[PDB]
Amino acid sequence: LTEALPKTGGRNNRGRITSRFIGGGHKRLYRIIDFKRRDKSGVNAKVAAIEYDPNRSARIALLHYADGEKRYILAPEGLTVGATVNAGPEAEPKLGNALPLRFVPVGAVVHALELVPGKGAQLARSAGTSVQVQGKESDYVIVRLPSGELRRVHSECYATIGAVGNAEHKNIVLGKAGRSRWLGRKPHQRGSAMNPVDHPHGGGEGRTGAGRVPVTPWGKPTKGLKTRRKRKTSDRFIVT
Amino acid sequence: AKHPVPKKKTSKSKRDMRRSHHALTAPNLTECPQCHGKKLSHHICPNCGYYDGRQVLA
RNA sequence: CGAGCUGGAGAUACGCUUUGACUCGGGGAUGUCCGAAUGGGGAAACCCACCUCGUAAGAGGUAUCCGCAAGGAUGGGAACUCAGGGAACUGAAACAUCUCAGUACCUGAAGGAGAAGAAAGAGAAUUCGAUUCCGUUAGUAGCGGCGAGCGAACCCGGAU
RNA sequence: GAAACGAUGACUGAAUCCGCGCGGACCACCGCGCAAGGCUAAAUACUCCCAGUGACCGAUAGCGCAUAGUACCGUGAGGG
RNA sequence: CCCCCGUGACAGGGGGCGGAGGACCGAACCGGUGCCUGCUGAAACAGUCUCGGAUGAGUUGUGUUUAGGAGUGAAAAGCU
RNA sequence: AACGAUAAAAGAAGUGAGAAUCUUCUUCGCCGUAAGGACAAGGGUUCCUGGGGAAGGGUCGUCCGCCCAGGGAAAGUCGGGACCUAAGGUGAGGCCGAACGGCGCAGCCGAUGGACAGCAGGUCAAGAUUCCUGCACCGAUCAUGUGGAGUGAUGGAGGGACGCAUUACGCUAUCCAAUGCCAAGCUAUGGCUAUGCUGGUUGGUACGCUCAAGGGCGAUCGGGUCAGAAAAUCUACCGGUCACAUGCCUCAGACGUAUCGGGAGCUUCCUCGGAAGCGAAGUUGGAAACGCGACGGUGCCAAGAAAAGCUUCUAAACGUUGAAACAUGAUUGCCCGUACCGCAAACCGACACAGGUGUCCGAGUGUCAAUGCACUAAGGCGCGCGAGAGAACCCUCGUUAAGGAACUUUGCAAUCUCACCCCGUAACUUCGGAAGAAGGGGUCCCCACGCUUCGCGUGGGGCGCAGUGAAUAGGCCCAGGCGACUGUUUACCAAAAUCACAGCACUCUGCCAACACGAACAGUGGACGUAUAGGGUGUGACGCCUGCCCGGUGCCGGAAGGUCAAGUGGAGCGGUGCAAGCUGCGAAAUGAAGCCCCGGUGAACGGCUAAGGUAGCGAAAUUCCUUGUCGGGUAAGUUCCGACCUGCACGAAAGGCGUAACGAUCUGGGCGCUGUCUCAACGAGGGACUCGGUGAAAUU
């Protein structure tokens, strides 16, 4: 049980319900996690403890850097209490060390991957997710992201050795409605159980369906929702 | 609404005709034997309070 | 002004008045607190401060936007004026262009009025000579699912 | 529309007085004007307020009120 | 968790002990199943009886947020 | 018609013009986890006193929550402000926008949370942690004395700081018992003569070597600067040195002593009922919190506000000759709230309305327990018409010969069953269940003995028709449909087979994500998340499974070609001028996404021409003919179960088939019981009828 900030609940924007469903669940305080790790380069840290920290799905390791500054870090699958850890270019590719992709070997499994130097971790953060290094290009490294997509991440971006913790959300089977409620409000309200007024599927006389669409107009099974943007150049082979 | 209801106003005649039996019957007042102020038969005289002798106060 | 007055109040008491009450004109001096509201806060009319002078009582100051400053501005107006924005019912015996109509409404700015105004003009006389307003031209010319229907201007006569 | 002229959001972007704009595509000729700077009384519109008048009303009329935006209704706008 | 018995592809089974649950019965409390009553009501939706939930996807105060083709909706075109 | 719950009333005495209705006495009855008491909201003088008696009061009033007049409301410590922050609101500067305006960091506003000093009594007609009395406490300012030096932000750190369940030990509030104590008297009906009866039986504070559960704590010297912006003697980290039990520190509460208080009652006066004075006893034993000790123990996952006050640090600063802190005086003590009603005749419901309204306290006896049920304390109340009668009929009830579902759409309704203890208990199953299955027996009183008590066990005896002797109080079972389950819904005719659900799938989205709100290159939600995540669609636990058709439509993918817009391109055609020229119109070619066209795709829309049903089910919530046909059950079976197949018109995530358990679901059967019924009777209460009082309505 250790220090953090309060994460007050909210399911609607500066007015009305914008992200559908979302509502119940326990109180939960926000724990500040170290995603950047750069300002602690060269300083060694000891894994004080791993902790149950909601807001995440992935475990959290309580780190103590020899200077006195205690920081929380995404605990990776394998990290134990007492195991030392360091950040920077001058840092070994060992369990829990933060080092840019240029110093990171090929085929070597990583997580907490950035996208722009500084900013912080943005890829493979959930438990069990990992990015595997494919092979260095120019001032960019090709990687295999959790989805299966290949991205050009510029070598200068930090990473953490190993796959993310919390083994597997598998034996977690919820079981009863209300385990869902311990977290988020009655989800999936069928649009076919709605009225012509309410949603496009809604209406008719009994059980049905006729054209396949979401809440508003669109269509959902197979329809490229992606834009014709810049980031497409720093990307290779999408599908799955 | 108010299920059975009257079909026509009942005339000034008709209304008064059913009234033929409403006329009150005046008491059969008798003179009192010992204070003379009238009394009801079989009742105690209200004035002297007698019923052969004086039964009630005042 | 010239004997009354003491508000409607018609009610008793106290009184005031020709050393001119009362009422009528016209200027002053007071003018709590809220309100643009303006020290800060606020569920108007209440709560809480700081500065300066001051014998305590008490008096003055503490909003933002223009500009050296002087000095100006915020808010309020029944309708009328111009501007930004701008419907539908309705009519077309249905309706979509069209109509209703740049009407209703909202919003901004302002005044006792405003707007507009001193020809890169009107129009065919090598006439006129800033603008507005009224008459008339004239239901003309024209517009128009060339349908419903819409509808000028010059000339000339006047207000100025 | 044969649709000129004004105006202008986007893109362009001239001449300087043997110059420039217009005269209902457009060209010639004839004719009327000086843009891209500003100010401006008066006649005109209205009626919160005041006065005067009326083939206007006179208490179910006339303003909603012979005075009340009250009583009363409504959470409120509002209605009365 | 601590002890007792078993082995032939089997697991377990016994005692203690602990104190789990959209677990059970049931009041407060939330609710509205069936009948009657009530239908110019005691009441513009109720009453007596009976009945569902009753540690949960629970109930409830204050404060605050979302509204008009708009909100909200464990979804009746419900509620506003 | 009604006069607003069937919780009653009776009499006497008084008052008055007038009395069922106002007052007083004595009874009666009703509530008593309330129908008693204390708040909050809300109301606004309704509060108390004296007077009134037109209207209001469902009747009458002499009375009132009504009408008039007067009065009453007292705070340094209680609640709020002069303190703090949450959601939210606002917001100089800053980001957007036809206007109006929309956002938005710090800051500020905002309690429903944090923080913080007073306890016991007394008493107006009407106030009390507010006034009075007794004794405290808090901050500030100053005077005195001790101290003899530091004080220590707007900044740092520590602290405030927070769940759900269960539970060990001590306690108190509080409650019971008695031949404990104290007080008052008396009783008699037959007795008792007190070992009977009734009542009371200790709060505040101070001091105390007295008993005390439970709770809380490491101390110090160092090292790195790379951590807290900087500094720190503070805090974090690493290290060295004594950290078992103990050891410190605090004492819920009890006990003793003293003192102020209260205390059953007793007493004197009385203008009829108050005022004043006095004042006994303080035991032993039991029970006991949701309160206190306390931030205790354990277990669990869904992982449990912030900020100030507070404590510790240094920066700046004034300073060491007059410090901070302690101690004893004195002085000081702002604003608003405070009456009264407050589960209701004072609030919301037009009404003195059978409804609604957040928190707290809520006694005794009996009953495993309890805030249940019955009676009852304290306390409150009899519900603002009354009186007769004892018809029809209507309502709420009690009993019922013989029969027992024959009632009927349907056992609708109403019975039966009913608590606790012992015995006992089926198919089926997901191994938990089904289960309170089903069924049987016990239950009171006394005495003896045994024991863990309020008690319970064995034995013997007693009484009644009957012993959870009254109240609270499951009827049960067989089979089927649907839905797995708890849950949700049509406020006011539908609670369900609807919606949701755990689980499954298709699919989209690489992060300024897809998507969504929006004037908007604003801002925001998704998300302080990041593909073991988020959006959308569908199916709907679990088990076995989920087939064939890609022609049309949609989606993804191809591009060799056909089509295809603005623009580029200006060949050519024409107007006018004497002309240079200025102008109207203007092909070919080239020019993007889209469409034609090719292939894929089914838990894509769909079908059973692109193919004609794989299992499984089938007269079905699907079957027209139809009461299909045979079987079951019945005396008799349009329904129901079972087969069969001729499926008008089943069929595999618009899921197919099954499934233990669950259900105010729907269907058929059985046992039980019964006024549903043959077939109705008697009895009760409230109305209906009668008199007095008040007196509506739709309709015409």
Ligand SMILES: CC[C@H]1OC(=O)[C@H](C)[C@@H](OC(=O)N2C=CC[C@@H]2c2ccc(NC(C)=O)cc2)[C@H](C)[C@@H](O[C@@H]2O[C@H](C)C[C@H](N(C)C)[C@H]2O)[C@](C)(OC)C[C@@H](C)C(=O)[C@H](C)[C@H]2NC(=O)O[C@@]21C
């Ligand atoms: C309870 C009192 C209220 O009356 C009511 O509700 C009762 C039940 C309704 O009766 C009826 O529906 N039935 C009576 C006979 C058949 C019918 C009926 C038919 C089928 C079923 N089916 C099942 C299987 O159950 C049930 C009933 C009333 C009488 C309705 O009148 C009937 O309308 C039919 C359309 C035409 C009928 N005639 C003309 C042939 C006519 O009689 C109605 C519409 O009111 C609903 C009238 C208006 C005036 C109102 O609204 C008043 C103000 C009501 N409002 C209020 O509050 O008081 C009320 C009087």
Ligand SMILES: [Mg+2]
């Ligand atoms: Mg008259």
Ligand SMILES: [Mg+2]
């Ligand atoms: Mg007026």
Ligand SMILES: [Mg+2]
């Ligand atoms: Mg029950």
Ligand SMILES: [Mg+2]
């Ligand atoms: Mg039940």
Ligand SMILES: [Mg+2]
């Ligand atoms: Mg904010």
Ligand SMILES: [Mg+2]
């Ligand atoms: Mg009677």
Ligand SMILES: [Mg+2]
């Ligand atoms: Mg008789």
Ligand SMILES: [Mg+2]
């Ligand atoms: Mg079957």
Ligand SMILES: [Mg+2]
């Ligand atoms: Mg169900």
Ligand SMILES: [Mg+2]
């Ligand atoms: Mg249910």
Ligand SMILES: [Mg+2]
């Ligand atoms: Mg009568």
